[PDB]
Ligand binder design. Sequence first.
Ligand SMILES: O=c1ccn([C@@H]2O[C@H](COP(=O)(O)OP(=O)(O)O)[C@@H](O)[C@H]2O)c(=O)[nH]1
Ligand SMILES: O=c1ccn([C@@H]2O[C@H](COP(=O)(O)OP(=O)(O)O)[C@@H](O)[C@H]2O)c(=O)[nH]1
Ligand SMILES: OC[C@H]1O[C@@H](O)[C@H](O)[C@@H](O)[C@H]1O
Ligand SMILES: OC[C@H]1O[C@@H](O)[C@H](O)[C@@H](O)[C@H]1O
Lengths: 271, 271
Amino acid sequence: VSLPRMVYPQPKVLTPCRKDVLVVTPWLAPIVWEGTFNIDILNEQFRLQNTTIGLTVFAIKKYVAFLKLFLETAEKHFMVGHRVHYYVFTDQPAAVPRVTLGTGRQLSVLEVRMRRMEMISCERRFLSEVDYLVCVDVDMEFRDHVGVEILTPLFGTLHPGFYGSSREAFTYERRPQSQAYIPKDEGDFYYLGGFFGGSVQEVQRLTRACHQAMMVDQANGIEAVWHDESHLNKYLLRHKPTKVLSPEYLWDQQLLGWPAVLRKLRFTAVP
Amino acid sequence: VSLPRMVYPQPKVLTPCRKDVLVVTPWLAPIVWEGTFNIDILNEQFRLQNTTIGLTVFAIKKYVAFLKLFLETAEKHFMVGHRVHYYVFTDQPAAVPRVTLGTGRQLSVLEVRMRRMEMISCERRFLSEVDYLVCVDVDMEFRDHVGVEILTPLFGTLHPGFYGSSREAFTYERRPQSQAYIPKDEGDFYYLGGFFGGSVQEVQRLTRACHQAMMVDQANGIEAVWHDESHLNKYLLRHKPTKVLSPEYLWDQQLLGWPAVLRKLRFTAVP
Ligand SMILES: O=c1ccn([C@@H]2O[C@H](COP(=O)(O)OP(=O)(O)O)[C@@H](O)[C@H]2O)c(=O)[nH]1
Ligand SMILES: O=c1ccn([C@@H]2O[C@H](COP(=O)(O)OP(=O)(O)O)[C@@H](O)[C@H]2O)c(=O)[nH]1
Ligand SMILES: OC[C@H]1O[C@@H](O)[C@H](O)[C@@H](O)[C@H]1O
Ligand SMILES: OC[C@H]1O[C@@H](O)[C@H](O)[C@@H](O)[C@H]1O
């Protein structure tokens, strides 16, 4: 379908949006920073396709206390104007708070008792209900826009403690006996376990692969240094994401401040 | 499928590849420039999928004289290592020169008598034979690498006489009675009629749409200022390409020199 007529500033080939940061990976995936995207054009494109986004959150034992702020801030900032289906995985269905949702948005509570990967790979339901899955930590809050600019077949998010580091400094799993093993001379980025996603197909592949690798490590008496994050990082090394989210998309202002290079802090740790 | 282990320089989030040029459109499509891509990673990715690329060229009447240099330079520079199927559309089958081709590459002569769009929309054959179609002018020669970095569902190429211009300066069709009409305040870029492409599906859509719009203009006694290029530009305005090729991909050194911003001249006009 054709975009309607729209009026917006012209891109200029000879003036970069951002000259301070890398905005495209070497396999030609956009790195999403403020100033790189016109949200109006993106909103039009995803709306024309009637895109539905699923958002998965786990809230088990004490973590149920984080849902109320998580959800209420999601209502302000996460895919507003688009269809959204929250999937809350919890051991305590009656501790899920009652959060008023905007039109076109709905919330399912799934009772459950490193196995987020496993639980995410609920497979037939997701395929019939949403186009994209976004998989985040619950101990977080949205503080600014997190929209359709993220959507793509496969994305991860650059780890805040790690974006300036040489790769030998990255906390990849370094022991060869782990399936998550990455040697010292390999690696593009350090991606966070707490904010990843993609098409339902690609996320099911990812979560399947990672769950299979963690089972293999288990049977071999090995647990990867950073658990499911370590396996994610090996997956994304071998299967390059089609977008990378900048640290704007997962930050901790208490621990890391608010540097100039981050024009927006969109989704952050809770105090 | 998983990429094998590979060793290559680390991307650095805090050091851009290119700070002199826009490398991502505002709808998050890569703009392909030298220094933005690691060809080794891209080659691995497209090879794992056994990608076949079709290259369509029209060589009608006197233009048959251009085929020999076109083809021989294509053999040196165009998708080398990948499977390639040249489709030469000509009124003179016996004037197609005999050009030795590398392994995994083949050439079909199609006899024919603004209607490139029409002829390109040969529909069932392309779908069964190639993954991507690239559609270029014949009066051209390859001088450097033109590879898989271009491939994507839909691409155009930024016009050399126009990449620094404000949009009101672009030679879009400006009369409202043409289907190719773009007003003064709209437009992202000026794309060349001579180098476009995409998945077979997306190119058939494009060529279909443009052929339909040119038929409508015909029945109304109108011909767009720059013919099929004008319609391409309207199409790509309303359906944004998923990559944009920089002017490295279509240049005229005689007329425009070799500016510093172009690190490579890959495909150029013939003297
Ligand atoms: O119900 C949960 C449990 C964990 N997490 C996230 O995953 C991280 C670590 O998981 P886990 O607690 O199992 O590791 P541990 O804290 O026990 O060492 C937490 O810090 C959170 O940011 C979450 O979102 N919901
Ligand atoms: O057999 C042909 C005829 C044209 N062209 C390309 O399309 C352009 C213009 O087409 P055409 O010649 O129909 O316009 P005209 O030159 O007659 O004004 C030429 O300059 C070429 O760059 C081509 O590749 N092959
Ligand atoms: O080195 C990787 C680790 O770095 C810590 O800052 C983070 O809190 C961990 O969850 C993990 O990402
Ligand atoms: O203004 C658009 C025109 O610009 C000319 O340089 C080019 O040779 C034409 O074919 C067309 O692109």
